[PDB]
Structure 1
Amino acid sequence: MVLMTKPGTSDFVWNGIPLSMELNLWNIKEYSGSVAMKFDGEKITFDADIQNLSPKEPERYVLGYPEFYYGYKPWENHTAEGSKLPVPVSSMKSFSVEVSFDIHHEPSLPLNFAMETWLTREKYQTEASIGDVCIMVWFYFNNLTPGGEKIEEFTIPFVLNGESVEGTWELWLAEWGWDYLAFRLKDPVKKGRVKFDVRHFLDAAGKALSSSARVKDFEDLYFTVWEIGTEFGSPETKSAQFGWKFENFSIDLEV
């Protein structure tokens, strides 16, 4: 059992895969109340009942992103030992990700269930800047839209509860300190099991950024990490009650 009740990171191994869990309240300046994140060998759970919230920077909009991840998260300069990432995007033949999840939250809270990676020019950067890319995949959202603006839609297959389906994904793009691309599933799923190949999203992103003047050689960027978690909160959020459970996690990176 790994149990955290304050912001921090812990490495763990689940089904033979080395991972990191981060009770991530990155944009919260202050709060009162409770947070708890736990891994017990079969599932990872997170619960929060916090109040008196204020952001470190409202321009960033969200307040936090409790999560777990496989690989190297640039911002924390951290990877658990034994990860196959980072690798150049061009070396990835396929990268299957599967996980069961159940998200619960008070109705008014801005929240998503989103996975993400950071594509960087150098292998072990400690930040993203111009030339780098953040790609997110949102399977659920409540009172929250992605940053930037919606520019396209893509039809990308995934397996939902064991059944192959074709999802329709909106692609939202923002040019900030780095390029932000968020694919948002149009029929969000709040509880279920999903399995999909990240390569489809990398392919769509590479097409969308083909005429970019900021992102130069997409396929030469390093795919550093795969994060799974829930962003939550807006600049007006003063309290947050929500949590989640993730189970049945597996990956298959073919390089």
Structure 2
Amino acid sequence: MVLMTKPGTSDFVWNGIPLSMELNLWNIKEYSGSVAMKFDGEKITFDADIQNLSPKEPERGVLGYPEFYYGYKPWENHTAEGSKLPVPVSSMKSFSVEVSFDIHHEPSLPLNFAMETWLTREKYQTEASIGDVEIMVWFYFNNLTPGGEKIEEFTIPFVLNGESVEGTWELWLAEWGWDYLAFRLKDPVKKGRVKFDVRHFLDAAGKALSSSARVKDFEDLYFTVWEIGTEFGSPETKSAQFGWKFENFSIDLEV
């Protein structure tokens, strides 16, 4: 059903779930080489062998974020048809996400396996800005650090390979053009199956930002989307070779 070999977006449906996949190289000015993303009905795979890389904005650190998502991504003003997102955070009872993944990459490549959402003041913004929140959940990372500084750590459960684990998550916060929160699992998992509820993270982000001058009414913000992907690169990265595979995907939003 879906095949992309250049930056772009496409909707598709997986096990009845409407989704969008983006071959996202947002911070790459130019590159040579190959990129291929594909959805075959049963799994999503991504592969990259690119060279002559240079960032558009070196200050942003990473170079790209090939991914697929459920919902409405503000920045692209896009959503596949039939999505249940966006919804106000305060209306989320639980949001269970499950996926099996396998990531491979050249050893020195700054890379991570990250999931995130954008909490916007208004339902359908086309950007995030002061008053909004970007929240990431890193299940894996390699020669990559989240932006900002570490503030606290949280113990948050998730089911690894079918076994309930009590993960230890560092929380990184930065206040740039928007509020940035990144939950980094202290024991990265490079291949496996995870199941967890986004709500726990939301609860934690809420407490962390409870004294912010910028973010005003946390529970009132719109939970717009859930992205799943891998960020890569750094301003010094000149070439990149890595790839991944996602499978056994399923979600459950309870309003």
**Normalised-by-shorter TM-score class:** over 0.9
Distance 2:253 2:150 in 1: 29
In structure 1, how many angstroms separate the alpha carbons of the residues matched to 2:189 and 2:107? 15
Instruction: Give the unaligned 5+ runs of structure 2.
Output: none
Distance 2:59 2:221 in 1: 27
User: For 2:202, what is the secondary structure of its paired residue?
Assistant: helix
Residue equivalent to 1:20: 20
* Separation in 2, partners of 1:3, 1:12: 11
1:72 offset after TM fit, Å? Answer: 0.2
CA offset digits 1:25-59 (Å, max 9, x no partner): 00000000000000000000000000000000001
Secondary structure of the corresponding residue to residue 219 of structure 1: helix
Q: Tell me, what secondary structure is at the counterpart of 1:130? A: coil
SS at match of 1:195: strand
1:203 alignment partner, SS class: helix
Counterpart-to-counterpart distance in 2, 1:59 and 1:219: 31
Q: CA deviation at 1:110?
A: 0.2
Q: Residues of 1 paired with 2:168 and 2:5: CA distance?
A: 37
CA drift at 1:179: 0.2
CA–CA distance in 1 between the matches of 2:159 and 2:16? 23
SS of residue in 1 equivalent to 2:65: coil
By how many angstroms is 1:133 displaced? 0.1
Aligned-residue offset at 1:138: 0.1
Q: Deviations over 1:128-161 (max 9, x none)?
A: 0000000000000000000000000000000000
Inter-partner Cα distance in structure 2 for 1:61 and 1:7? 19
Partner SS state of residue 78, structure 2: coil
Equivalent in the alignment of 1:7: 7
- Deviation per residue, 1:185-242 (Å, 9 max, x gap): 0000000000000000000000000000000000000000000000000000000000
Question: What secondary structure is seen at the aligned counterpart in 2 of 1:72?
Answer: strand
Offset of 1:95 from its aligned partner? 0.2
1:115 is displaced (CA, Å) by: 0.1
Structure 1 residue 104 and structure 2 residue 104: aligned? yes
Q: How does the TM-score come out when normalised to structure 1?
A: 1.00
What secondary structure sits across from 2:79 in the alignment?
Answer: coil
Aligned to 2:71: 71
Deviation at 1:83, TM superposition (A): 0.4
State the distance in 1 between where 2:203 and 2:24 align: 29
Q: Determine the C-alpha separation between the residues in 1 that align with 2:5 and 2:221.
A: 35
For 2:31 and 2:108, the matched residues in 1 are separated by 18
Provide the rounded CA distance (Å) in 2 between the counterparts of 1:53 and 1:141. Answer: 21
Q: Distance in 1 between matches of 2:151 and 2:15?
A: 38
3-state SS, counterpart of residue 81 of structure 1: coil
Segments of 4+ moved more than 4 angstroms: none
Shift of 1:107: 0.4
Matched, 1:52 2:46: no
TM-score normalized by the length of structure 2: 1.00
Q: What are the Cα deviations for residues 154-173 of structure 1, in whole angstroms up to 9, with x where unaligned?
A: 00000000001100000000
DSSP 3-state at the match of 1:208 = helix
Q: Distance in 1 between matches of 2:14 and 2:195?
A: 17
Cα deviation for residue 16 of structure 1 reads 0.3
For residues 1-255 of structure 1, what are the structure 2 equivalents within 5 Å?
Answer: 1-255=1-255
